[PDB]
Amino acid sequence: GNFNVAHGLAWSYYIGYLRLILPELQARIRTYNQHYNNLLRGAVSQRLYILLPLDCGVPDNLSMADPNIRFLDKLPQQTGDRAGIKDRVYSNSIYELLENGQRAGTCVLEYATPLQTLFAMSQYSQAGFSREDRLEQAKLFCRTLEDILADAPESQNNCRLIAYQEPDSSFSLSQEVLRHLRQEE
């Protein structure tokens, strides 16, 4: 039950998003860094950072949560004709991570959108899922996504999953991403 739901969303996240964008991402980041960002310490990192809040709380504005996360720019758009929709575009947003009034990191950052479906399905009676089902579904989504990416040809050190339990006044989202960014080289 909680397995089959998470399993389906994780695969849909891969087939309809990650497998299509991850192959070209490093070229899009490289082009951006070469032409638009000649800051020797302000380079966009080479990986998509995907935020997996395990409570499934996904704000549509990622900057609002944390004064130390500021929207910088959009990467160059990627467009595809998909199921009779001409030029279905994929956009990715670059964010500035601030630490002690200084820029500490710059990366392509987003939430995993499917967690918003797990939240909704816990809220609507017709879906038939409790809040304890949603936590199990969030965990199994993360584990299934990690398992897909481990054997995926399009995952070439170009994707990092960031999972955390904090929904909070003692939690810094910028600090959470900065710890992952700094661990890599």
Ligand X SMILES: Nc1nc2c(ncn2[C@@H]2O[C@@H]3COP(=O)(O)O[C@H]4[C@@H](O)[C@H](n5cc(-c6ccc(-c7ccccc7)cc6)c6c(N)ncnc65)O[C@@H]4COP(=O)(O)O[C@@H]2[C@@H]3O)c(=O)[nH]1
| Interface ranges with a copy of itself (CB under 8 A) | 1-9, 11-12, 15-16, 51, 58-62, 71, 74, 77, 80-89, 91-93, 95, 109-114, 116-117, 120-121, 124, 126-128, 137, 147-148, 151
Residue 85 interacting with ligand X (CB under 6 A): yes
For a copy of itself, give the closer residue by CB, 42 or 80: 80
For a copy of itself, give the closer residue by CB, 60 or 185: 60
Residue 105 interacting with ligand X (CB under 6 A): no
**Residue 17 contacts which entry, ligand X, a copy of itself, none (Cβ below 5-8 A, type-dependent):** ligand X
Residue 16 interacting with ligand X (CB under 6 A): yes
Residue 17 interacting with ligand X (CB under 6 A): yes
43: left (phi > 0), else alpha (psi -120 to 50), else beta?
Answer: beta
Residue 13 interacting with ligand X (CB under 6 A): yes
Cβ pair 109, 161 in contact under 8 A:
no
- Answer for which of 82, 131, 179, 182 binds ligand X (CB under 6 A) is 82
Residue 63 interacting with ligand X (CB under 6 A): no
Residue 12, annotated ligand binder? yes
Cβ pair 121, 135 in contact under 8 A:
no
For a copy of itself, give the closer residue by CB, 41 or 153: 153
Among candidates 68, 20, 45, 21, which has minimal Cα distance to 176?
68
Q: Which residues here bind ligand X, judged by CB under 6 A?
A: 12-13, 16-17, 82-83, 85, 88, 90-91, 110, 113-114, 117
Q: Residues at the annotated binding site?
A: 12, 17, 88-91, 113
Q: Residues at the annotated binding site for 3',3'-c-di-GMP?
A: 12, 17, 88-91, 113
